[PDB]
Amino acid sequence: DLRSPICCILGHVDTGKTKLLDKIRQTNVQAGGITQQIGATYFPIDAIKAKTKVMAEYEKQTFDVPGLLVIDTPGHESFSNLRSRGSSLCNIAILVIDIMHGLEQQTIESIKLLRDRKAPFVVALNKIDRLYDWKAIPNNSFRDSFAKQSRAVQEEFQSRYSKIQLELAEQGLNSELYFQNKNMSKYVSIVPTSAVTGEGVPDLLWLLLELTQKRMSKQLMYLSHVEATILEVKVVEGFGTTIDVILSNGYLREGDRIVLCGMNGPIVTNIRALLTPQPLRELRLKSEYVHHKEVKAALGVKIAANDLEKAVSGSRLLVVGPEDDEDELMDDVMDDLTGLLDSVDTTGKGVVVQASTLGSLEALLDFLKDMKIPVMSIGLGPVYKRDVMKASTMLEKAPEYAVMLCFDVKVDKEAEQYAEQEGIKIFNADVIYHLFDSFTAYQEKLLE
Ligand SMILES: Nc1nc2c(ncn2[C@@H]2O[C@H](COP(=O)(O)OP(=O)(O)O)[C@@H](O)[C@H]2O)c(=O)[nH]1
Ligand SMILES: [Mg+2]
* 251 shares a domain with 393: no
* 185 shares a domain with 275: no
* Residue from 331, 332, 311 nearest 263 by CA: 311
Measure the CA–CA gap between 410 and 30, rounded to whole angstroms.
47
**Which ligand has the minimum distance to the alpha carbon of residue 198?**
1
**Which ligand has the minimum distance to the alpha carbon of residue 100?**
1
- For residue 247, which phi and psi values (nearest 5 degrees)? -95, 95
* Residue from 130, 123, 142 nearest 200 by CA: 142
Measure the CA–CA gap between 257 and 339, rounded to whole angstroms.
24
b/e map 6-33, b = 16+ CB within 10 Å = bbbbbbbeebbbbbbbebbeeebeeeee
* 347 shares a domain with 336: no
User: Cβ(106) to ligand 1 under 6 A?
Assistant: no
Measure the CA–CA gap between 115 and 104, rounded to whole angstroms.
17
Atom of ligand 1 nearest to the CA of 130: 1
Atom of ligand 1 nearest to the CA of 19: 15
User: Cβ(130) to ligand 1 under 6 A?
Assistant: yes
Q: Are 199 and 193 in contact (CB under 8 A)?
A: yes
- In three-state form (DSSP H/G/I as H, E/B as E, the rest C), the secondary structure along 40-82 is CEEEEHHHHHHHCCHHHHCCCCCCCCCEEEEECCCCCHHHCCC
Task: State the amino acid at position 35 in one-letter form.
Answer: T
Last residue of a domain, one of 223, 239, 259: 223
Number of domains comprising the chain: 3
Helix (H, G, I), strand (E, B) or coil at 123: strand
* 47 shares a domain with 22: yes
User: Cβ(17) to ligand 1 under 6 A?
Assistant: yes
User: Cβ(18) to ligand 1 under 6 A?
Assistant: yes
Q: How many whole angstroms from 117 Cα to the centroid of ligand 2?
A: 22
Measure the CA–CA gap between 198 and 200, rounded to whole angstroms.
6
Tell me whether residue 195 is annotated as binding. yes
Q: What is the CA radius of gyration of the chain?
A: 23
Residue 246, C-beta contacts closer than 8 angstroms, at least 6 positions apart: 6, 39, 40, 69, 71, 88, 89, 228, 229, 231, 298, 299, 300
* Residue from 203, 120, 204, 108 nearest 164 by CA: 108
Instruction: Tell me the technique behind this structure.
Output: X-ray
Q: What CATH number corresponds to the domain at position 369?
A: 3.40.50.10050
* 337 shares a domain with 360: no
Return the H-helix or E-strand segment holding 165. helix 151-170
Return the H-helix or E-strand segment holding 17. helix 17-25
Q: Are 201 and 286 in contact (CB under 8 A)?
A: no
Measure the CA–CA gap between 53 and 393, rounded to whole angstroms.
64
DSSP 343-397: HS-SSSS-EEEEESBHHHHHHHHHHHHHHT--EEEEEESSB-HHHHHHHHGGGTT
* 95 shares a domain with 228: no
Measure the CA–CA gap between 35 and 52, rounded to whole angstroms.
18
Tell me whether residue 19 is annotated as binding. yes
Measure the CA–CA gap between 157 and 138, rounded to whole angstroms.
18
Q: How many whole angstroms from 19 Cα to the centroid of ligand 1?
A: 5
* 248 shares a domain with 197: no
Measure the CA–CA gap between 376 and 117, rounded to whole angstroms.
25
* 262 shares a domain with 213: no
Tell me whether residue 17 is annotated as binding. yes
Measure the CA–CA gap between 430 and 347, rounded to whole angstroms.
30
Last residue of a domain, one of 310, 342, 374: 342
User: Cβ(22) to ligand 1 under 6 A?
Assistant: no
Q: What CATH number corresponds to the domain at position 203?
A: 3.40.50.300
Helix (H, G, I), strand (E, B) or coil at 317: strand
Last residue of a domain, one of 203, 223, 243: 223
Residue 297 half-sphere exposure, CB side, CA atoms within 13 Å? 27
Measure the CA–CA gap between 352 and 389, rounded to whole angstroms.
10
* 249 shares a domain with 332: yes
* 233 shares a domain with 337: yes
Return the H-helix or E-strand segment holding 94. strand 92-98
* Residue from 244, 229, 327 nearest 6 by CA: 229
Measure the CA–CA gap between 111 and 117, rounded to whole angstroms.
10
Domain ranges, residue 261: 224-342
Q: Are 153 and 142 in contact (CB under 8 A)?
A: no
Q: What CATH number corresponds to the domain at position 239?
A: 2.40.30.10
* 302 shares a domain with 246: yes
* 207 shares a domain with 63: yes
